[PDB]
Amino acid sequence: LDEATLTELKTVLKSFLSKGQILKLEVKVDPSIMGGMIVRIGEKYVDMSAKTKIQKLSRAMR
Amino acid sequence: VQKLFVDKIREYRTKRQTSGGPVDAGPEYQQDLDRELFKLKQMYGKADMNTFPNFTFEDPKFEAVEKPQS
């Protein structure tokens, strides 16, 4: 991605912790996630992706 | 994911444009719905659409008892 959408996520990910610290990060590209991003601050895992096609089993689940 | 909420309704409306049953059946849905239509009649029975019950019953014949008495 570009600079205007990454320097926010390198700063809005600092708004969570708030303990006098200097953050670090890794990036890995995966296309099987079709339309989102997953992130793991420690052991947190806020998932927003194309898993939400499998969550439409409830339409087929009576 | 309300952007996915609109995108599974809008490709449900496309399924509501139907002419003859299946859209991509081919030899698949034509054979399977005919294989299953036999099995609801195969071990069940041979039955028409509107034919009433047509039969006739005969009761037990009342024989007599011969009896010289006194």
Curated annotation (Swiss-Prot), chain A:
The modification N6-acetyllysine is found at residues 10, 14, 24, 28, 44. Acetylation at Lys-14 decreases ATP production. Deacetylated by SIRT3. The modification N6-succinyllysine is found at residues 10, 14, 51. It comes from the Eukaryota. Coiled coil: none annotated. It is found in: Mitochondrion; Mitochondrion inner membrane. Component of the ATP synthase complex composed at least of ATP5F1A/subunit alpha, ATP5F1B/subunit beta, ATP5MC1/subunit c (homooctomer), MT-ATP6/subunit a, MT-ATP8/subunit 8, ATP5ME/subunit e, ATP5MF/subunit f, ATP5MG/subunit g, ATP5MK/subunit k, ATP5MJ/subunit j, ATP5F1C/subunit gamma, ATP5F1D/subunit delta, ATP5F1E/subunit epsilon, ATP5PF/subunit F6, ATP5PB/subunit b, ATP5PD/subunit d, ATP5PO/subunit OSCP. Belongs to the ATPase delta chain family. Subunit OSCP, of the mitochondrial membrane ATP synthase complex (F(1)F(0) ATP synthase or Complex V) that produces ATP from ADP in the presence of a proton gradient across the membrane which is generated by electron transport complexes of the respiratory chain. ATP synthase complex consist of a soluble F(1) head domain - the catalytic core - and a membrane F(1) domain - the membrane proton channel. These two domains are linked by a central stalk rotating inside the F(1) region and a stationary peripheral stalk. This is ATP synthase peripheral stalk subunit OSCP, mitochondrial. It comes from Sus scrofa. The chain holds residues 149 to 210 of 213 of the full protein.
From Swiss-Prot, chain B:
InterPro entries: ATP_synth_f6_mt, ATP_synth_f6_sf_mt. Its main location: mitochondrion. One of its GO terms (cellular component) is mitochondrial inner membrane. The modification N6-acetyllysine is found at residues 3, 8, 41, 46, 61, 67. The modification Phosphoserine is found at residue 70. Keywords: Acetylation, CF(0), Hydrogen ion transport, Ion transport, Membrane, Mitochondrion, Mitochondrion inner membrane, Phosphoprotein, Transport. The keyword Membrane applies. Component of the ATP synthase complex composed at least of ATP5F1A/subunit alpha, ATP5F1B/subunit beta, ATP5MC1/subunit c (homooctomer), MT-ATP6/subunit a, MT-ATP8/subunit 8, ATP5ME/subunit e, ATP5MF/subunit f, ATP5MG/subunit g, ATP5MK/subunit k, ATP5MJ/subunit j, ATP5F1C/subunit gamma, ATP5F1D/subunit delta, ATP5F1E/subunit epsilon, ATP5PF/subunit F6, ATP5PB/subunit b, ATP5PD/subunit d, ATP5PO/subunit OSCP. Subunit F6, of the mitochondrial membrane ATP synthase complex (F(1)F(0) ATP synthase or Complex V) that produces ATP from ADP in the presence of a proton gradient across the membrane which is generated by electron transport complexes of the respiratory chain. ATP synthase complex consist of a soluble F(1) head domain - the catalytic core - and a membrane F(1) domain - the membrane proton channel. These two domains are linked by a central stalk rotating inside the F(1) region and a stationary peripheral stalk. This is ATP synthase peripheral stalk subunit F6, mitochondrial. It comes from Sus scrofa (Pig). The gene is ATP5PF.
